[PDB]
Structure 1
Amino acid sequence: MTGILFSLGASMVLGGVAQMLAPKARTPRIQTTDNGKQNTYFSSLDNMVAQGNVLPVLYGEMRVGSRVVSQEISTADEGDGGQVVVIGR
């Protein structure tokens, strides 16, 4: 039930007036593999691996590239779904 009480104004303002009214947004770290391509934390346009990674969340209209769950190559069936199928010329 004792102590000394200090003034926080000079300590709070030390960063900037803006951070007192609203936090600051984060910027991804820079990698030189991109040849200067700049990234952001809320967009991804390429297909990523699946295991060990989180399932993303999309909040608005945007172009998306999504984690791959399956991928295969096989020979295609000749029938197109109709009763009549014609092979060759």
Structure 2
Amino acid sequence: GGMTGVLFSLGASMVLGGVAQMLAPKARTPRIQTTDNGKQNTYFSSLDNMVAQGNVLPVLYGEMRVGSRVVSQEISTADEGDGGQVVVIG
């Protein structure tokens, strides 16, 4: 137990994947679909309304106009009324 044989140095065994990978951990590209055609969406953009069923609530960090997750949509009859008494319908 005094000695520690089999030092087993690791050099190119970790370089073999690439050198910038051992300084920066790289990024994950999304999966490409077919019905989506060629619109390569990323993981930090959403310009359409989503559905909030058993999903997570997204967060925003700066600028970059985004869509939303619809929680309630309803149509009723538009009653006549303003912020006052002027209610002419002639």
Q: Establish whether TM, by shorter chain, passes 0.5.
A: yes
Deviations 1:40-87 (A, max 9, x none): 011111000011110000011111000001100111011122112101
Query: Partners of 2:17 and 2:78 in 1: how far apart?
Result: 63
Runs of 4+ off more than 2 Å: none
Query: Partners of 1:77 and 1:3 in 2: how far apart?
Result: 86
**Counterpart position of 1:73:** 75
Superposed CA RMSD: 1.3
Where is the strand percentage greater, Structure 1 or Structure 2? 2
Where is the helix percentage greater, Structure 1 or Structure 2? 1
Count of aligned residue pairs for this structure pair: 88
TM-score, length of structure 1 as denominator length? 0.91
Stretches of structure 1 that go unaligned for 5 or more consecutive residues are none
Query: Partners of 1:80 and 1:17 in 2: how far apart?
Result: 67
Q: CA deviation at 1:5?
A: 1.8
Alignment of 1:1-89 (within 5 A): 2-88=4-90
Task: Report the 3-state secondary structure (helix = DSSP H, G, I; strand = E; otherwise coil) of the residue aligned with 1:67.
Answer: strand
TM-score, length of structure 2 as denominator length? 0.90
Task: Report the 3-state secondary structure (helix = DSSP H, G, I; strand = E; otherwise coil) of the residue aligned with 1:2.
Answer: coil
